[PDB]
Symmetry: none
Subunit: 285 residues, 5 copies
Amino acid sequence: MKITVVDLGNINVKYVGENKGRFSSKITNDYQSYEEGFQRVEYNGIKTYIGVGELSREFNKADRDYMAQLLYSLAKANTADTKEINLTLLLPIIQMKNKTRLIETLKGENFKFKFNGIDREIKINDLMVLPEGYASYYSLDIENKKGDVCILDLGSRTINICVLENAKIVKTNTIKLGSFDFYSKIKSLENAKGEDYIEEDIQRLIDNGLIKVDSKQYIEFLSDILNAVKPYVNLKTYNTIFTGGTSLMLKEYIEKLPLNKFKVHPNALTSNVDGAMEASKKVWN
Amino acid sequence: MKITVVDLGNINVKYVGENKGRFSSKITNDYQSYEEGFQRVEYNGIKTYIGVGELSREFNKADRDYMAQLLYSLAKANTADTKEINLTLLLPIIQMKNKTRLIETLKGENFKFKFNGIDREIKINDLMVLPEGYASYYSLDIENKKGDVCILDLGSRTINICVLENAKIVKTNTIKLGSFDFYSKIKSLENAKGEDYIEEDIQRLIDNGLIKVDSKQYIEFLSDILNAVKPYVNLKTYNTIFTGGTSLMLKEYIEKLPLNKFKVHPNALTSNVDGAMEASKKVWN
Amino acid sequence: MKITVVDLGNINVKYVGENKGRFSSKITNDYQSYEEGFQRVEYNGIKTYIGVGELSREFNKADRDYMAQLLYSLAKANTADTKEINLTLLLPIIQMKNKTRLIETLKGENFKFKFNGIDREIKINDLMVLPEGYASYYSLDIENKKGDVCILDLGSRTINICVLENAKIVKTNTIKLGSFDFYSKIKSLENAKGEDYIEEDIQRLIDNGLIKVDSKQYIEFLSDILNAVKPYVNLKTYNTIFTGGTSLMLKEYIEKLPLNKFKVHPNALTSNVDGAMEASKKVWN
Amino acid sequence: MKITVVDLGNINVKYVGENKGRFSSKITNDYQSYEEGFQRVEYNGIKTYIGVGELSREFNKADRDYMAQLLYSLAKANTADTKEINLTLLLPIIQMKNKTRLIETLKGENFKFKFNGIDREIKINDLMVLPEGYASYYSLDIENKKGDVCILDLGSRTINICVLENAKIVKTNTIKLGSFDFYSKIKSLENAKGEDYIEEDIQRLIDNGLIKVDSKQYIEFLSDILNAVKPYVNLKTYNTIFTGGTSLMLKEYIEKLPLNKFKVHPNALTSNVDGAMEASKKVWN
Amino acid sequence: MKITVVDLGNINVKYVGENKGRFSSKITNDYQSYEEGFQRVEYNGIKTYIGVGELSREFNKADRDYMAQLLYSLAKANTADTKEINLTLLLPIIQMKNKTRLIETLKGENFKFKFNGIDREIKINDLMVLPEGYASYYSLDIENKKGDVCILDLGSRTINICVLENAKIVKTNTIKLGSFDFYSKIKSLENAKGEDYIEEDIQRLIDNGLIKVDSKQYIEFLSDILNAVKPYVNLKTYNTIFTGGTSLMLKEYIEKLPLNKFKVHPNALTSNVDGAMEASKKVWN
Ligand SMILES: Nc1nc2c(ncn2[C@@H]2O[C@H](COP(=O)(O)OP(=O)(O)O)[C@@H](O)[C@H]2O)c(=O)[nH]1
Ligand SMILES: Nc1nc2c(ncn2[C@@H]2O[C@H](COP(=O)(O)OP(=O)(O)O)[C@@H](O)[C@H]2O)c(=O)[nH]1
Ligand SMILES: Nc1nc2c(ncn2[C@@H]2O[C@H](COP(=O)(O)OP(=O)(O)O)[C@@H](O)[C@H]2O)c(=O)[nH]1
Ligand SMILES: Nc1nc2c(ncn2[C@@H]2O[C@H](COP(=O)(O)OP(=O)(O)O)[C@@H](O)[C@H]2O)c(=O)[nH]1
Ligand SMILES: Nc1nc2c(ncn2[C@@H]2O[C@H](COP(=O)(O)OP(=O)(O)O)[C@@H](O)[C@H]2O)c(=O)[nH]1
Ligand SMILES: [Mg+2]
Ligand SMILES: [Mg+2]
Ligand SMILES: [Mg+2]
Ligand SMILES: [Mg+2]
Ligand SMILES: [Mg+2]
């Protein structure tokens, strides 16, 4: 009946159902004393405190314990009364076969969990999966659908390329690259001097003004994500729709490019989710 | 019972049966993840995603894996219920003997294939073959049949000449030339500067306004396709019927010629198919 | 006085001067702590660690920062005492005009650089440029020069065709294709399952026995590089000289072809360099 | 002052001045990257690379862009110092009136051109024109001049007949036929099987041993060029002087004919040029 | 003359010279009455009792009072007679520049100290520094040097990764993680109940059987140190050499991994020291 979309992501989880929103992908099974005060979920006796701790850098995200974050998002989006829903997950455009390993464990499965002590249960009627990037196309404006575009989802570790002709995909590819490698690069020189920073506590430092990131350190990352797309796409052609949070981290610089036709998608952070929302409406409704 | 006509072509496939239409000749056996979203066919365990990828530039088109495109066209034209049909293929006017190598593999053969996952089967009662150009004559209007005409099919790589006297052919020839060489010429100067274009993604660029093709670049191609026909035909004589997609690419210029009597065939893209359709009606029906 | 030849290439750099040799085209500007242990060069304050990192997939290789690799090759080939030399670079056969943008920045220019901390300087008397493929002809044996041959340089991303009549070139063309697309194809299915491989760390895997490349995966690449040469050359004619590293990657299979006269050039990896070496001798000496 | 003779021909250009010689009639305006390496001429901003490309099959050779080949021959025959010369062109024996359209554009005209980058200029004092065949008579030996002969110039597409009584012409005619039609005939069956040959790259194949031309395929061409001369000449009468390159292509067979008196002209390839050379000497000198 | 190697470490000091050995990194400046009975060193009037007390958790170990432990190790390794030696210290692979701040204070410096009341003096001819991990490669067996390996030094707080191709390093990185965080995790739940344990007195408890460490508490730490290496290395590739004491704390579990090729280095505790010993021999001797 109700429909929900969950982009697990590697550093941010983005859910949209009856109530939309997002949070961080950090998950930790470590023991914690002041449980009342964290965001936590206990599934079949194992507890996880979300929003803090490690990052689960594992690739191939159909097996990276996509477990407590999913239920937490389901609880946070819908309400306690809801029992049966329809899930529309978003896997990368190169790992779409892994849905076989994904449906077998979720479809027609009843999940009971605490969600901060207020225990509840939820079932899913049917599961659905879409590739990242492709979904963001549907959220796109009509003016861009007609032409030949190139959805370029710049994730945290995955760049997903989906070249769309007049309402038909042509090229579909994935590249291992994103903001995470940039964070590793920054820490490679920061931790070197005397410090102890890591990939998780390094974006907040830039936000709060401790890491003096030079203007050209972003230019290098731009030219590195564009020296990995030439074999598959010519950006001057194929009017582009930059999406993903990484785009907003470089929006002030992506607009100063020698590209003849392009744009940065509005609400890029939630585009891949909103488009999948439309698609789910089209299918079930 | 039912009749179908399939012009495989080198850059466009054109089929006409219960439901007419066309598509691109691009075929690729490359692995693709998001299979659901492409147009695909799996024959005896080998899969092909049609409409994207390579071009299969091989000449002598009786052996260029005329395999998945044919079945895809058969499925797209007729319906799932249909089992037995009559095929009327169109080989060039110089490769008509190769029908021997063509009939032996198709006549009385049952073909089973997926066609985007909805597996089906089809048999062909008898196979028939006609030369390109000659067939387009039958689709021609009556006013032109009476006179002495010269069907000039300007394909992508083959110019087929069929000189018809009063309902009887006289001269029959094939020339290696067409729009593909023009595309190669354009890329020879475009890719030279800094670019990476190829023969496949170069027509769309002209359509979408990135390649500033000069007016005389078409004039050169016209005079090059006419400096290859003088030995066999004098165009001023033999009222001509330009056909093939290449003609429409030059219709605005072919009409400004110093030729005493000529025309560009209407629906030239599908003339060679419609005429063969009439001929098949005449034979079986 | 001294003469040097440098084929920058896209995945391998090949230099021949007083001391010949080669290395990888990988270049990275990323900060590195243990500088002593890498191969590095600092030019006008920007440092580059060669042999590791990215690949610089940019086409039109007259602008792809052909900068630190060139000086590194110059230092590694000649000795510290040498000051003035003559450079004979090798551009592709379709980008030979870009020498205008190449000579203006190098001719009569003194370059000072570190080369692993032992700072030195070097000047070049005059610059010279030759097209890829054509140069490899001169390294060829006499038995093949007399006839009508077709130098077919199968690079990593560029196939360069130079058809030579009796000591005179006829056809000259470039095609965007090579081993890099094959690596992308392999990773398209390897990274799909659960892995994280990329075009750079994928050949070593084949060498060390982790990627079970099927025998027909090479056959597909052969027939794909031969379905891109028919319009320009008929391989049965024009006795062929396969060159480039890609040929050695397929030497065991290129010899089982239905071609009437052909061969795989010995030391194909360095043929395009040795031939240019002869030509430079002829010109200056 | 100096004198030059230029037989443009349809497949071979033959010039004789201070330095004699010949080359191929192939001309192409197509863009080419490695300009240094071809034989090229740029006239008033349009460039042509001679010796490669198309063939310019147009008849009535007073308008077939007789433009870059002429200047190239002039430059190659004479030297850079020469400024004013006397031209003696050779039109067919049926198109001798077209000299009106030829003199108006050349006489007293200064032509400036590059000739492979070494720009130069040249003027012509007066222009002269002679018919093909007739000129070859003057190069003939004295033993044949006295009698009643029949100059039979077997060109590539034109057979020129000039019947000479005792130093006076009687019959003068032209026939559309020659080696080009034979090449078209050969390709009509070669390209049919699977191949892609054309009239331009088909003689070299015979020379290099790929086309197994049967002995009687030449006999058919002989009897076809002799079934087109009976109405105008009886070959048994009128002791004949076969000239033109086509004769050398059939010299081994023309000598086995049932003709009472005949011969194949020595240096037939250059006879029509040498005779015109004598005539020019007679007129101006 | 004599050579010594000192790995200060964060929880263990490891020295190798004329006499090898190790001890604990605990250092305390606190006053102690029964001085005779402890291991102590007094430098320029400040005394330190080694092997007991605090731990000096400071990172960037080029400034963490690397002072009394160093001299104590020097005295314990060599003998009283020795005056001049050569030091080969081991900094992490990300803090190798700090050698600048290290050499300035030690090179050519005479140090006088008590060493349990028997005052003595020592000078160092020259100082040398190597990165952790890289040094352990030299102690490795020949069978592993030839291949492409990945030295993975699992320290107490630092994981040092050095990817070695055929005798050449490629990737060099440091990660803040190790056994110390595991000890903090254990105490987080032990001290919670009623206890007062700390990171220093918690390993001995496991050894002596008071802390019932579950088998999966080590598995969590394994998967946490492997969820921090995927971005930089794929462990299935790059045959690995686990080193550092942490490896021995998990040797019984590291061998049950789904890794295709790996091993735990013998004498892992002293590998990083022995390899540096070889390197020092190579350089000075
Ligand atoms: N400057 C800026 N950056 C943002 C904002 N929101 C997200 N980002 C960046 O976008 C990245 C999130 O990547 P994400 O789209 O979640 O990757 P995914 O989880 O793999 O899909 C983070 O690294 C952020 O730095 C924002 O509001 N401002
Ligand atoms: N301008 C224009 N060109 C067209 C159109 N349809 C087809 N063409 C051109 O016609 C060519 C197709 O050639 P085709 O007839 O399929 O060759 P064949 O496959 O060998 O028979 C393409 O290169 C197109 O550029 C059209 O609607 N407009
Ligand atoms: N099997 C094998 N392959 C090789 C060898 N050397 C080079 N190659 C292949 O040749 C390719 C190098 O292409 P290259 O000639 O450098 O392209 P270019 O840089 O554009 O000129 C690589 O992808 C290698 O896989 C060899 O010794 N054995
Ligand atoms: N066997 C042979 N044939 C030749 C030779 N030279 C020229 N030919 C033939 O002669 C023809 C040239 O015809 P040509 O006299 O130039 O015709 P034109 O240009 O119209 O005057 C070519 O088709 C060649 O096959 C030769 O040395 N040997
Ligand atoms: N089980 C076991 N563990 C050991 C042994 N020796 C050392 N360890 C562990 O290894 C760790 C020492 O780490 P270390 O290599 O000194 O880190 P570093 O000082 O930063 O280089 C300690 O936490 C010990 O628990 C041993 O013999 N047995
Ligand atoms: Mg994403
Ligand atoms: Mg056609
Ligand atoms: Mg190359
Ligand atoms: Mg002639
Ligand atoms: Mg250590």
